[PDB]
Amino acid sequence: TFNDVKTSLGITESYDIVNAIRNSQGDNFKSYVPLATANNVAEVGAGILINQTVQNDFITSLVDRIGLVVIRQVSLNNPLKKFKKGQIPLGRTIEEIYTDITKEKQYDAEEAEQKVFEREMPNVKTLFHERNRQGFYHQTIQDDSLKTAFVSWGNFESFVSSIINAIYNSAEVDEYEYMKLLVDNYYSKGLFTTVKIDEPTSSTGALTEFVKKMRATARKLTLPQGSRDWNSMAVRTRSYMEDLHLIIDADLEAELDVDVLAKAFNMNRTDFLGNVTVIDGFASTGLEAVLVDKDWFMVYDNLHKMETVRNPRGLYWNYYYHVWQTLSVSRFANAVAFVSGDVPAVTQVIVSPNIAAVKQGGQQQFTAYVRATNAKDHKVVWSVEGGSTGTAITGDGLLSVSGNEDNQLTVKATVDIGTEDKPKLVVGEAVVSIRPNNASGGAQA
Amino acid sequence: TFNDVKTSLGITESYDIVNAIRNSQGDNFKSYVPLATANNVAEVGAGILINQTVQNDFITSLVDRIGLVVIRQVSLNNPLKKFKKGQIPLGRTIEEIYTDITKEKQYDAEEAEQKVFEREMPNVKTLFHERNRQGFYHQTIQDDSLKTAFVSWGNFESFVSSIINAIYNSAEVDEYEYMKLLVDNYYSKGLFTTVKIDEPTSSTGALTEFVKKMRATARKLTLPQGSRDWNSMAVRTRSYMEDLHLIIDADLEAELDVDVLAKAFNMNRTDFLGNVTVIDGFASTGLEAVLVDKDWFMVYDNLHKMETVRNPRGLYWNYYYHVWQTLSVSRFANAVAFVSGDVPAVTQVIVSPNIAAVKQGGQQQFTAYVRATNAKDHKVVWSVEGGSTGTAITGDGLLSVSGNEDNQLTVKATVDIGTEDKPKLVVGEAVVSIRPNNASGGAQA
Amino acid sequence: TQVIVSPNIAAVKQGGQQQFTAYVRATNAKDHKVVWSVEGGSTGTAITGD
Amino acid sequence: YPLAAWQVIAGSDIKVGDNLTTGKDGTAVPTDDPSTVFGYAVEEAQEGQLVTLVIS
């Protein structure tokens, strides 16, 4: 059902090889002058998009046939699938619970006469995950109308077996792409612990600097005493060298082994210390070479159903392949970003306990963890949003809730970056609900 | 729910059988007088189309009952089911290739000095039969509404199988009606070789003349040298006697038995040659009988599925019975029509090579066969239609081609039938591809 | 380098719709506009952006 | 099938919002004299191109 469609259809020729390029020349193309049939090789040698039916050269009533039919079969996969966690049939939310270390008290036998039964609570931080992805894939197969496209049931069944895999390849493509989105989501929110590097494309020396900061950071993570940076929740966590996964694209993997590793004599000294997963590349600006634990990913599966239906009077199957999955990342495992280019001086203020509850009249102590990307100092200004008449933080994060008050205080911790003409503020927030205090009684004297 | 419908619904009463018994005495209705209940048998004795509720004769409150349910299950067939060639599961198009005979040349002996390697292509004609009928059938079985209509499961189930048979019998009947259509198509297109003879059911000798022309034409088909006179492609083909099939209608069968085969001391010397199938009759006007080979019919099956579906909401089953089949006719096989009325003088102009591919500037010989009845000395007026100047054909058919043609040609062979006031033109046609040459002389002298 | 319309062979019923899309090979990594234009048609047949 | 808008071949150049009336061969042309107005164009069209506008 088509007309006289030309061969050079969707082709803008950067130069015509058919004309004076191979005809009128005293240059490079002189080796194609002795070819005789070269015009037709130049015409349809790239392939023909539409098969016009060609008569036989000798007996024009006959029709030339299709000799060989090739069915190209592709198999796509997910490199990031090795970071998945399992299946969640029931429920939606994932409660993640980390119990952190506490503070020492001094021994005193005399104060221990009255401070038995005293209370010191744990330092628990919680984090919450949720099903994000629920989409489906739809592929229709009309069985019976495809049989006119075929001889040879081997090629008919291989083509039908290919359309089902194209529903299965569309899951591998998207789940790689969603798990790549978890890196760029978590970098746009400033939650990575960024490390400023110079650009490794530019020189071999700035690459040699870059290799050190990977081997240094990977040592710092695996220190047995732990570290209260390198995560966004700012708790102390050790990591393991067999669990640190580097996610580095092939542009940066090619500059490494050509410059650093080949010219080195001791490859296990400038190596990258762990597991280098090779990504196609990040989508942000300047983000290179993410270093994360394997527990940083929290990817679970909710359902994998191939639900079908059949239209009788159409004689086709509709394949509905549903994928529902929980795609989120931890803030307890360590996550280091290696960023070239302009960074903020301070990317993140983290406030100790993110949530708190305190009786009206009580008090609460805070700690502003500053993720400054450089050896610099930054004084923190504390603040109370929603306070009124007595609720005030006294500097250094000691909230003193007054009394009379229940309207859910908000505690800010600001680091000012820059000039007074551009006072750039990096604010970390905590929310405080107020439990009432009936031990007082209104008036006092 | 119906109101007062009489038991005479569409009844056209030839006479009152009640009064012809009651009044008239001495005639043939006198034997119905000693019948006691003849007025009641005469009333509802033909069946009633609409059931009036009839009360009981002893107690008027009760109603009379439907005691017996009789389900007619008529199965039908296809009388032409023997003509089918099989099944094509894969592919769409069927190609028939016929290699015709060639023309003799005189022994040259001095023109062969330059013609040793001159080449002459065979007369290979071809034909392409593609899939035509792509249909389905359709029934609703709203069985929950049907359970009120029956009081037994033996009659509920025999009626449900009765609707399934109507799906299959409709396939049987319509496959017959397409295979009659292929005869009336081929006759309307004038591809049947008309044997022109007045009606067999008009007189006794016109019945015998038919039988003399039947066994003559069946002999002329099977001659071991063949003939061009009975195709629509005019190739020398040869029929065999066991493969000839005669498709007379039902009156023409009974005229053979009673009028010539009864009086036949030697019935083998009177009856029809070849196999004789008996059909209801051809739709076309005047077409009395059709004599074809077994190869004239090309009916292949492509699909026979039945798929069901259940509507849970309306509580019914759909029954879709799909029939896909290739319903085509081989133009290479001998087929003769016997036609009663006035026919035209020429029914078809057959043009030889008929798919040409000249060189641009070259020449092709075209010959035209003319189908005729009385025959005549008619004429053939050649032409050619394509937008070039140059490109003229002779009165002998030798098509000249311009050196700058670049358009597909359409060579005609027109025979005029009738007067110049209202001319009937029977036109045989061809096509010509041009195959551009490379003379590169733009302006000769 | 090259622009690629992704439904290469298409078949549309008269009075129907079809959604075409275009891939643009470009070395410069610059944003490039794709100018949709239908041809060979009559009065009535028109294409929009995307 | 009460249409709220039509596609009519422009008998001239038509601007968006122009009131339209019948022209040569039944084509749509710009007007200015209420009585001749049958519709208002919603898109610009050149002579020979269809223009789609609301009736009113």
UniProtKB/Swiss-Prot annotation, chain C:
| Protein's cellular compartments | Virion
Question: What domain of life does the UniProt record list for this protein's source?
Answer: Viruses
Looking at the record, the residues that make up the BIG2 domain are 1-50
User: What's the subunit arrangement here?
Assistant: Homohexamer. Homopentamer. The prolate capsid is composed of pentamers and hexamers of the capsid protein.
Family membership: Belongs to the phi29likevirus major capsid protein family.
Q: What does this protein do?
A: Assembles to form a prolate capsid shell of about 54 nm in length and 45 nm in width, with a T=3, Q=5 symmetry.
Return the protein name: Major capsid protein
Protein encoded by which gene:
8
Q: Which residues of the full protein are shown?
A: 350 to 399 of 448
Swiss-Prot record, chain D:
Which start and end residues of the full protein are shown? 58 to 113 of 280
- Location of this chain's protein in the cell: Virion
Residues forming coiled coils? none
Write down what this protein is called. Answer: Capsid fiber protein
Gene name? 8.5
The organism's taxonomic lineage, starting at the top: Viruses, Duplodnaviria, Heunggongvirae, Uroviricota, Caudoviricetes
Role description: Protein that forms the 55 capsid fibers. These fibers are not always present and may have been lost in some lab strains. They may enhance the attachment of the virions onto the host cell wall.
Say which family it is in: Belongs to the phi29likevirus major capsid fiber protein family.
- Signal sequence span is none
Q: Which species is listed as the source?
A: Bacillus phage phi29 (Bacteriophage phi-29)
Record's subunit section: Homotrimer. Forms a super helix coiled coil in the homotrimer.
